[PDB]
Design a protein around this nucleic acid. Structure first.
Ligand SMILES: Nc1ncnc2c1ncn2[C@@H]1O[C@@H]2COP(=O)(O)O[C@H]2[C@H]1O
Length: 197
DNA sequence: CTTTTTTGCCTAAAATGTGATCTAGATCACATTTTTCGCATCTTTTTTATGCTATAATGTGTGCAGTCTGACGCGGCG
C-alpha cells in the first residue's frame, strides 16, 4: 500500500519496549502511524501519580490532535509497551497528503467516533457505577479481545493482573479483593488467568 | 564432538496479601427568596347608540311570463 511507498522514504522507526516516544509539552510537528506493536497512552500529576488514558494497537494513528492548530504541545505520554514498528510523518507533509488524497479520512473518522463511544462510556461509568460494575464491564469485554483463548463454556484471558490495573487505571489489590468476591458470586473462575464463563 | 535448547539457578524484582482503621460522601423532611402567571382596578381608546339638517318637492306598473295540459273540482251559471 502507501505503507511500502512511504517506507522507501524511510521514516519508519523501530522502537523497543518503554523507550519514551511522547513526552507532553514537546513540540507538535510530526505525526506517527503504526505498523506493528502495542503502546499505552498515559498522564500524571505534578506530584507523580500516573494515569493510563488508553493503549493503542497496530493500524492506528498517533498524535493527530496537533496538525489542526499549528504549533501545539503534545497532550499525553505514550510509552512503548513492546517492540514497535512506527511511521513518522511531518505535519507539513501530512497536510500535503491531505490535499492529495482524503479517502484516508473515510477510515480514520470511524475509529475516532468509537473513541468517543468508549470515552463517554468511561466518564459515564466513572459517575454511575462503583468498582463492581467497573471491573465487571472490564472483564466482560476483556473476554472479547483477540489474544482471548477459549474456555469451553467461557473464555480465558492470561493478562494476569498487572496490565489490568492500567487498562482500567486502578489498584490491583482491590482488583484482588473483588476478584475473590466475584469468585464468591460464582461469576469468575480464576487462578491468575481467569475464566469468564 | 559440537551445537542449541532448555531449566534451574543466580540474581535481581515486581505483584500478592494483613485487616485494621478513618473520612470525605450523600440522606434526609421541612422553612425561606425567585419565576412570571390569574382576576380585580385604571385608562385610554376606539367604537357605537343616539340625536339634527327649516327654498322647494305630492298615485306604481317596470320588466318580465310565454302562455303545458288533461282531468277533475268547484263556483257559478245559467
Ligand atoms: N481517549 C483517547 N483515546 C485514544 N487515543 C487518545 C486518547 N487521548 C489521547 N489519545 C492519543 O494520545 C495522543 C497524545 O498526544 P496528542 O494529543 O498529540 O494525540 C493524542 C492521541 O493520538
Amino acid at each position: 500500500p502507501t505503507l511500502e511507498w512511504f517506507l522507501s522514504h524511510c521514516h519508519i522507526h523501530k522502537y523497543p519496549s518503554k523507550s519514551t516516544l511522547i513526552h507532553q509539552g514537546e513540540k507538535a510537528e510530526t505525526l506517527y502511524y503504526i505498523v506493528k506493536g502495542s503502546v499505552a497512552v498515559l498522564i500524571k500529576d505534578e506530584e507523580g501519580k500516573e494515569m493510563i488514558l488508553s493503549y493503542l494497537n497496530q493500524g492506528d494513528f498517533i498524535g493527530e490532535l496537533g496538525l489542526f492548530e499549528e504549533g501545539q504541545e503534545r497532550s499525553a505520554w505514550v510509552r512503548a509497551k513492546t517492540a514497535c514498528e512506527v511511521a513518522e510523518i511531518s505535519y507539513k507533509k501530512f497536510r500535503q497528503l491531505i490535499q492529495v488524497n482524503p479517502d484516508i479520512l473515510m477510515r480514520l473518522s470511524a475509529q475516532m467516533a468509537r473513541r468517543l463511544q468508549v470515552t463517554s462510556e468511561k466518564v459515564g461509568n466513572l459517575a454511575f457505577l462503583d468498582v463492581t460494575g467497573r471491573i465487571a464491564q472490564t472483564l466482560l469485554n476483556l473476554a472479547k479481545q483477540p489474544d482471548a483463548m477459549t474456555h469451553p463454556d467461557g473464555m480465558q484471558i492470561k493478562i494476569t493482573r498487572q496490565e489490568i490495573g492500567q487498562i482500567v487505571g486502578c489498584s490491583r489489590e482491590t482488583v484482588g479483593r473483588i476478584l475473590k468476591m466475584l469468585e464468591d458470586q460464582n461469576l469468575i473462575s480464576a487462578h491468575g488467568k481467569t475464566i469468564v464463563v
